[PDB]
């Protein structure tokens, strides 16, 4: 049963650890993307304001 | 299970790392493109204003 316990936890958590680790890339990516999108829209909407 | 953990994380994050790395190119590209689009519309809309 101790092997059954470490089987279920170690396997299922490792799957749930990877998707959360992947979501961290989207979070850090979306920050840098939105930061770049700020400049994209800033230079677009401000320069076209003339 | 430690191999199962590094399998899921290392694989799934590497896929999510590449798409975020690709999105950085669009972000930096869109800034330079919008910056060039500013001149394109500026010279177009200002010179045609005469």
From Swiss-Prot, chains A, B:
It is found in: Cytoplasm; Nucleus. It comes from the Eukaryota. It comes from Rattus norvegicus. MVP 3 mediates interaction with PTEN. MVP 4 mediates interaction with PARP4. This is Major vault protein. Phosphorylated on Tyr residues after EGF stimulation. Dephosphorylated by PTPN11. The vault ribonucleoprotein particle is a huge (400 A x 670 A) cage structure of 12.9 MDa. It consists of a dimer of half-vaults, with each half-vault comprising 39 identical major vault protein (MVP) chains, PARP4 and one or more vault RNAs (vRNAs). Interacts with TEP1. Interacts with PTEN and activated MAPK1. The phosphorylated protein interacts with the SH2 domains of PTPN11 and SRC. Interacts with APEX1. May interact with ZNF540. Required for normal vault structure. Vaults are multi-subunit structures that may act as scaffolds for proteins involved in signal transduction. Vaults may also play a role in nucleo-cytoplasmic transport. Down-regulates IFNG-mediated STAT1 signaling and subsequent activation of JAK. Down-regulates SRC activity and signaling through MAP kinases.
């Amino acid at each position: 049963a101790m092997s059954m316990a470490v089987e279920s936890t170690g396997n299922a958590k490792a799957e749930a650890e990877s998707r959360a680790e992947a979501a961290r890339i989207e979070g850090e990516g979306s920050v840098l993307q939105a930061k770049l999108k700020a400049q994209a829209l800033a230079i677009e909407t401000e320069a076209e304001l003339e």
